[PDB]
Ligand binder design. Structure first.
Ligand code: FAD
Ligand code: FAD
Lengths: 607, 604
């Protein structure tokens, strides 16, 4: 079914009219890619997403993969594999890949806009297709000889996995017990059982799979510092030609039954447990595991956040299309009259409230991840923001937990409004929104839970950063607030910005107080997620207000037709968000300012 | 054990230590039911729920019902039918049923506490068991001759359905096109196609099904007031002996594929479309359909709210059990130390925040539906609250959309915390939370959407009521206010809710001169309903904490003491972390404008 509804219009609005990413197209790194070609690419992949890729969305959930425990392999439904081949045949598993690996150079902001369509149409299909992007990470961290293997893996389209989690080491990656035994010739034998590994087998989609495995070398120290990263291929291969050889000793031994995202095989992975060594090669031939793996984690966190946002967007557009056609009830101005005309439900206030809530968050979230991506290239950050490379890296690092944590939590919550808009029909599998909800629930968990996002945000991206990136962003919001038709929105933003600054000061204060009373640190934990969500709301309202300022300029200049309607919606979204979402941060600030440890002192038996 | 984790302790605490429902036990209608027996009943049905009822919770979802087009019937999984037999064999489908239909007289507050356990363990099992209760409603509204059939239906345990919805008439009940044609012999032939009918077929669970069908007699008016209610049995039967006769012309034509609650067969139901007439009997031989039907609707709305609350409770207790045993991470006071000992995750602040949020809403919601139920018996309301019958009915009517709307929305939202507590494992079908979420999503839709609940609440239960029930409840909150910090926070919340009510009232009355003003009522209606729910939750938790303080001062020990300590902590947490948000919501409601209504549809 054609469940997927795309929004290239909003993407191009952000990329060119708001952020001006076209400034760098046709110049330096992107010398061979112009704005017209970028638009055509977005339109092409959106068309592919709405057609062949979206067409197996239902099939993958209703006819999910089947595991053969004796072969340690998974069979995927044929319709989904056809969608994968459509993706490969169009070169879309090589989006933004380095030119020397066969890719088309482009800014990250354009790359994630392209990927959004796959994540909206069939997110597991993009996940299976992340191999080449992970081969590039292996390339960047590898020896000269390992770079040769990475080039083969990328050219041949091998799949890949990130292998961290164990039954007793999920959020606490440093507790992992999977071990690496050094061999005389410099290779390693990996031994352990890992859990919840995405794409650990993928039927016959690929020639090979590159497992990137965190493991502790024998006798290494404890914690994350003692971990190393290893290249562990499913098949041994000829390192010069790429010709596939003997099966390596790394076998899927279970596939989980999940709430959603069912077509993505989520696997228990056994290394060196079946009498065959799991041979691994030390990435870069250095012991720097968690640093190397965080290149992979950051990409995964960006993908998950963008996935949540893509899913909410098509959720909203499905609900909108339904509301426009569903006739139910009289206009509320006519409710007493038992003979009044029945109207389409977009006429009802609560439906317009729901739809505008969906719209504002979906479009605010789209702006967030594209804004985040403009700091992922130094050249783009310099051209559009005027910030140097170091600050740009700090700002991207600050925004990733917002994209991931705030994005995942918001999308799942607002999809509830999408389903509600359909009434009783929303509970039916006939419509895609119940699957959107199930497929999206994992986004608050995979690649680090929301709580982990919030702790990374505060401790690493603000405190350890000495507030530099946060002060930059705050300065940009302040400058927008300074400098008629958006006065009330700017006043509401000024209050929200002050609220967030108050929150940051309070949590910082609790951290300082921990010098004297260690228990005071618990208050940082108690408030960390609410703080992360508040910054997300602040950024959403700010970027929506920036969009409204651009929309006002285009309307003043004489926009007509569909363009005019688009711009009018941007003004309404920014105003609605500022008046209905931002004021809550004031109460949240007061709640955070009054946190106490009563709930930490309570006996566990009292719960 | 099973997926289902019950909480009789909290139920008894509410029923006896907080509301004092035991005052009426052993007296008048409840002469034969004492406190000890009520508690034993709760314990016994909780065991039934945790045992045979919960046993098929997974099976019903993984092996869902099948529609057979060769016979126009639905087949149910054997394990679930075994659970249903355990329910009937125990005499539980006659809980709160009138004594003359074979029931055990009891306060409604006890009845719903008992039903909570079935709704938490396998809610579709209660829905299939709603037959006798709907037969009683037929009895009460029926003629003397019909009362005899209703007695047969109840005694034989026939299934029953509520038949309102059509493809173009869901929320708008009055737009239905199903028609009724009177026959020479005084019966009626019903013709129409109805949608989203729960329990429309039930395999071989019952010997008959009573369909209660809204239909428009030919020549009748256009609105809901033009509707009449008809008794339409699946099988004809002997009106004196109950012997089952020929098939009546009412057939299921499909079974919907749903996100959850899969073992409850939700079907399109066609009347008089398969070659033979769907014979119906005018209920009470009077044309008063929507009024008769809302007896059934009120019961359904109480059921849905209690279902949502029951599901959140077992979701919370599953998450708590998991958190107590899951070891992950060092204590936050030892973040820096990578050599530090690993702890169970109840040690982590965000987990305790999550668990206390689940606890406070689950227990606050249980208090709300039990509180609501104390107004559903005149003698209980008199005994425990000192309120006459008329005010009690108005207060119950005021609270029903909160139980349903606030309960359904809150339960689904907070189950998100329950699943989150499990980490990645929460996403697995190996644990029950993911099914709880899917089964719960329907609660905001079935028996009136949240928006319909909010409109009923404001327009019918407050405005048309001239604010009397609301004034009563506000007066009880103000009396408790007059636990110092909690009472101060409750005073702010009460004032916030009163400000909200005044603002929405202004928008409604201003619609006389400016029609579009009414839209601001719709814009704020749901947020107002949820705010009142938060206020009631905070107030009732504070009342529980006040009782808990008294019991602790009197020397409570051991598990009792732990329980009482938890109530104090939940009341304080709720007042400090949930109630203040109502202040921002009031100011938002006070500044509602119609920009979103004036926007071109094309701009969305
Ligand atoms: C599984 C299931 C079980 C059910 N069981 C029963 C049952 O046994 N019998 C039965 O008769 N019904 C049953 N229902 C139907 C249910 O009771 C509701 O009447 C119906 O589901 C809601 O109407 P709809 O589905 O057509 O949605 P719609 O009426 O089309 O509502 C669509 C959207 O519009 C909104 N909307 C509609 N009118 C207004 C308005 N005036 N103001 C504001 N917003 C408005 C709604 O809130 C919703 O967001 C069931 C539903 C399902 C899915
Ligand atoms: C479908 C799926 C796909 C996945 N894909 C991948 C993948 O490809 N590769 C991979 O390596 N991993 C993967 N994971 C694993 C995933 O990253 C972990 O499940 C997740 O990060 C948390 O680990 P856990 O499940 O053990 O939860 P736990 O770590 O046990 O967490 C349980 C709860 O405790 C909380 N908690 C734990 N520690 C703390 C703390 N210090 N402070 C506060 N709260 C805390 C959490 O927030 C959560 O609420 C996947 C998971 C799933 C379910």
């Amino acid at each position: 079914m054609s469940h997927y509804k795309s929004n290239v219009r909003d993407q191009v609005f952000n990329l060119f009219e708001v952020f001006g990413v076209d400034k760098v197209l046709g110049a330096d790194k992107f010398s061979d890619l112009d704005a017209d070609t970028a638009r055509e690419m977005l339109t092409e992949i959106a068309r592919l997403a709405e057609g062949p890729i979206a067409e197996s969305f239902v099939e993958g959930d209703r006819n999910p993969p089947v595991f053969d425990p004796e072969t340690h392999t998974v069979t995927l439904p044929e319709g989904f594999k056809k969608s994968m081949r459509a993706l490969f045949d169009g070169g879309w598993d090589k989006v933004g890949l380095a030119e020397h690996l066969g890719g088309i150079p482009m800014p990250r902001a354009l790359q994630w806009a392209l990927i959004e369509h796959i994540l909206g149409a069939n997110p597991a299909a993009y996940m299976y297709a992340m191999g080449p992007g992970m081969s590039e990470i292996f390339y960047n961290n590898g020896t000269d000889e390992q770079k040769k293997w990475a080039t083969i893996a990328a050219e041949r389209g091998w799949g890949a996995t990130m292998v961290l989690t164990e039954p007793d080491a999920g959020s606490d990656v440093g507790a992992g017990r999977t071990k690496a035994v050094q061999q005389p010739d410099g290779t390693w034998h990996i031994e352990g059982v890992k859990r919840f590994i995405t794409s650990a087998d993928s039927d016959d989609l690929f020639e090979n799979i590159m497992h990137l495995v965190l493991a502790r070398p024998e006798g290494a120290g404890p914690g994350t510092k003692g971990l190393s990263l290893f290249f562990v291929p499913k098949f041994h291969f000829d390192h010069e030609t790429g010709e596939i050889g003997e099966r390596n000793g790394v076998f899927v031994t279970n596939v989980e039954h999940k709430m959603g995202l069912k077509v993505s095989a989520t696997c228990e992975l056994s290394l060196g447990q079946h009498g065959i060594p799991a041979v691994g090669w030390l990435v870069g031939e250095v012991h720097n595991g968690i640093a190397q793996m965080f290149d992979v984690i950051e990409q995964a966190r960006m993908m998950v956040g963008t996935k949540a946002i893509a899913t909410l967007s098509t959720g909203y557009l499905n609900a909108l299309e339904y509301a426009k056609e569903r006739v139910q009830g009289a206009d509320m101005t006519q409710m007493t009259d038992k003979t009044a005309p029945r109207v389409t439900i977009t006429h009802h206030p609560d439906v317009r409230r729901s739809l505008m809530t969906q719209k504002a968050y979906a479009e605010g979230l789209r702006a967030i991840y594209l804004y985040t991506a403009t700091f992922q290239d130094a050249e783009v950050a310099q051209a559009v923001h005027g910030v140097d490379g170091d600050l740009a890296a700090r700002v991207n690092d600050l925004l990733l937990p917002i994209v991931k944590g705030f994005g995942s939590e918001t999308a799942y919550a607002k999809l509830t409004e999408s389903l509600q808009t359909l009434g009783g029909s929303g509970f039916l599998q006939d419509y895609p929104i119940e699957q959107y909800i199930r497929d999206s629930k994992i986004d608050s968990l995979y690649a680090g839970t929301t709580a982990i996002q919030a702790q990374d945000f505060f401790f690493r991206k603000i405190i350890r950063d000495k507030g530099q990136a946060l002060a930059y962003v705050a300065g940009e919001i302040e400058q927008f607030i300074k400098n008629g038709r958006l006065k009330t929105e700017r006043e509401l933003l000024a209050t929200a910005l002050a609220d967030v600054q108050g929150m940051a000061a309070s949590l910082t204060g609790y951290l300082m107080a921990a010098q004297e009373d260690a228990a005071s640190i618990y208050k940082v934990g108690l408030g960390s997620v609410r703080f992360l969500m508040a910054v997300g709301d602040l950024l959403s309202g700010w970027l929506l207000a920036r969009q409204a300022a651009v929309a006002i300029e285009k309307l003043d200049a004489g926009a007509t037709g569909a363009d005019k309607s688009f711009y009018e919606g941007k003004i309404a979204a920014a105003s609605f968000f500022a008046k209905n979402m931002l004021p809550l941060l004031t109460s949240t600030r007061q709640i955070i300012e009054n946190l106490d440890n009563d709930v930490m002192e309570l006996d566990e038996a009292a719960f």
